[PDB]
Design a protein around this nucleic acid. Sequence first.
RNA 1: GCGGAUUUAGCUCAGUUGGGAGAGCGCCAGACUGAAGAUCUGGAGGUCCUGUGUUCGAUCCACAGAAUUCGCACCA
RNA 2: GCGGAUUUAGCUCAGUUGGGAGAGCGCCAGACUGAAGAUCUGGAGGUCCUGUGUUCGAUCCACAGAAUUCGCACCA
Lengths: 437, 437
Amino acid sequence: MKVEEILEKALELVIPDEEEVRKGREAEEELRRRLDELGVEYVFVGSYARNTWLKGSLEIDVFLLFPEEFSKEELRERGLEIGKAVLDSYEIRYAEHPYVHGVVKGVEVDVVPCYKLKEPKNIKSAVDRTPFHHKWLEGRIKGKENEVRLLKGFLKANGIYGAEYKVRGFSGYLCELLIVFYGSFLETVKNARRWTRRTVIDVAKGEVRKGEEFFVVDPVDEKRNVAANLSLDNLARFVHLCREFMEAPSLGFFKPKHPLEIEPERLRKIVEERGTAVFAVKFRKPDIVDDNLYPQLERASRKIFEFLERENFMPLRSAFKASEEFCYLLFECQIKEISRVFRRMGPQFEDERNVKKFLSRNRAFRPFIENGRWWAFEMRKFTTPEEGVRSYASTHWHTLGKNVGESIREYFEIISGEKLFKEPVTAELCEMMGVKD
Amino acid sequence: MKVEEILEKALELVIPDEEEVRKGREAEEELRRRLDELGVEYVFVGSYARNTWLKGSLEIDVFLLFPEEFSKEELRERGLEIGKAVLDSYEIRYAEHPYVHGVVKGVEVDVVPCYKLKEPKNIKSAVDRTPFHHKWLEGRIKGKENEVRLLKGFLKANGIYGAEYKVRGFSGYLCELLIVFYGSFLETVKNARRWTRRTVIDVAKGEVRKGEEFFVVDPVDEKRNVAANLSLDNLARFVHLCREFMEAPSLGFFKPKHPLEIEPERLRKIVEERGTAVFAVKFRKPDIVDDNLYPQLERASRKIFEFLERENFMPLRSAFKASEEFCYLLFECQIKEISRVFRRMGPQFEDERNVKKFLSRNRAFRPFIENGRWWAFEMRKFTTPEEGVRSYASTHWHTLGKNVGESIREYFEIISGEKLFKEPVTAELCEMMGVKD
RNA sequence: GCGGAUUUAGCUCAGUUGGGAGAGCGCCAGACUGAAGAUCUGGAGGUCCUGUGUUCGAUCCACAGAAUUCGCACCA
RNA sequence: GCGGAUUUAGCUCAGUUGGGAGAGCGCCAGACUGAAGAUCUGGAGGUCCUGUGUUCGAUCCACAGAAUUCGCACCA
């Protein structure tokens, strides 16, 4: 669609200027006031300070640099003293060393105690690194901020922007590092088409090489992978979207695509036509952070997946959804019903000892030999994958993560077909089964 | 049941003396007459000559030794000339070098041209070896003939006596060699409990050792495995029956056990309770020898077995029966119905070339990535193992042996449940599923 | 008939994740030697038995066939 | 919290068919030496991280746990 046109029309949905821009300055000014009132060494960092934040994603990050001659707890008292007096409403978030989150004029503000540490390698944790992150990008990104926003937008539209585990996609800082390295969104897109699972981007030397994993080198600390949270699968998605974009560019790569919103009638048909067993594990949501839940949900999903493999219902895919109330573990298998009878692996014919024991056990059918080894017909306790998972969930809850497993242990349901379609899992089911529009 | 008593009561069902013993002598005498009438060098061998044949299993083996200074075809003319004149009704069976099979007074007689070859290593085929076989066992078996008959009886009662492929069990000559080696049936049974898949019995040296396969050394030619036809599985069966006999001896080890003879009503229930898919491939019997058909049937069964494994209906066992009219390939699977959808293995994400092609193909559902590799949902052409086999039989008949495959190629049926129970396959189905009485 | 095993470099053979065609020996060269050899380096060297099919992709999966090899035995 | 990787002989590590507990090094010995070393032979050497469970059978499969290790990050 001409390429450059859609790049510019995308900006009116990317660039903030819903006149929150000034609300930033207003809060900043106000923030700058009260802060200079207490004579503290302070820095504005993150999205706001570089004028790089997305439309609606307004956030002030304030990092309070504290003398390189104090102690952990002496900065503690301070961050509090300050945060409180400068913010309008507050909470305390402790991380690895605590910080104050609050609100100034409807703008989410992050008041954070730091160190006036000037120059790296003398770093203790991830927090003290962001000032340097800002420092290095400051002045080296000036002018190219729009191109960053395009990248972000591109990634958000297809749901791979973010460092949080719910996404495992691209971190903002990474995006910035990228735009810097290539020159613009596009020159990034072009080269991304040639990325591999072993492609390494050292921004510090301006060099591209092959390593062991996909690695983007932090120009501040060359021991740091900025793209550490980028999952294997997401990276590939990005690469493929870059190949798909260049060949036939369109604006639909920048619009966030919306729910397919189906009726139970069309979904049941798909299932029927698929001839697959579709079911889910429902259980109440344990009240914990997002960056804890999804990892557990994933682990939980995987084990059940692995289970149904062992018991040979042959699952296709697995999916998960977390509402404000419950959690759902979705599964589609190739086997609706398995036989009650199965092969039980018995001893080689020579080990008379073990033979007898194996034979001493009482069964409904005679054991036999095949390839110089005994085998026996025995009975399963479950015939459908629903029945099997029920057995598994009830007996092997503990392995399904700490909080998730406990929530299942205490209670769970298994929902099949028409009943399940009524649950808020429509979107993911379609995504799991790969339904067209 | 006392042990020795049942050994003696078994003999009245083992020792011939249904007064066919004299019919032997009568025919022998008559045979000896006409033969000496033509001045031929002749020998009586096999079961009859040693008085070792089973009750009802009466057969005269006559091997016509011919001068060690003739040629293949010059003996040929002779065997005929002789066979005809001495037998009452005849056929010609060609083997590797032909022979005359016929009847003298209702007794199946085998008139065979040989060589007066005295002493081995100058042998050409299996036929010229039997005189030496008889020669070596003659006089070294005298007195111990009853003990041989016990062994035979033991093996026949449980259906592992015979060198023909329908059985793949113990050859008579082998049994004799055994009784000779240990001393009696029992001393054979005791030691057989300690046989392995690598136990070697050299009768010539009177020695037991370990080799590579189960090997019984022919005292005549030490390059010959007498137990070559003994299948792995049958050997084990024998060994296990020897262990089972010594621990609790009973006469039921000598009675041939009879059909379980079931109704369709009890069989359907078992199937239902088993929850398994049971079906068979029916097709007309190609008119060929037994030692050709069963090998093919086996091969045929196996491939179908292997197929259902590939397509994951997960078969349990496989069985075959050959009537005077049709042949049956019986199968029991763990999967009655499989989903219409399956995983299609696609390329790794890097090989852009192959990616596109894989994606160019049209499907009902979107392809995806998992572990850096593309996968696609596609449709099977069959949902039940019956449907699948139908597809397989029709497309892959040729591999199912020469004659068998051709018979299926031209025609076949697949029969399920109630319909199949009406077919003469009741016994084997019970044997395949391991049903109790 | 019949069945199993085998078929990848000149020789002898590995090769299982369906994506890299390999080792040893032989041959050529380099290093080393006074020489040659022995050792270390390296290089060249291919109809993965043939055909067709399955697959995005084939030494590998399927079918047909070929060749080598061992045995099976019918006979009964 | 949160996740992954790892845990087999004194050290460093193989170990995939669920049935044999292994290699290299180290140590002792034999052979060889004038000696010792170097090489070849061999031997000893084990809580397969623990527990419980599955199985005829447990390094291998399942659950709980431990320890080592790397990273995840929430924060928003």
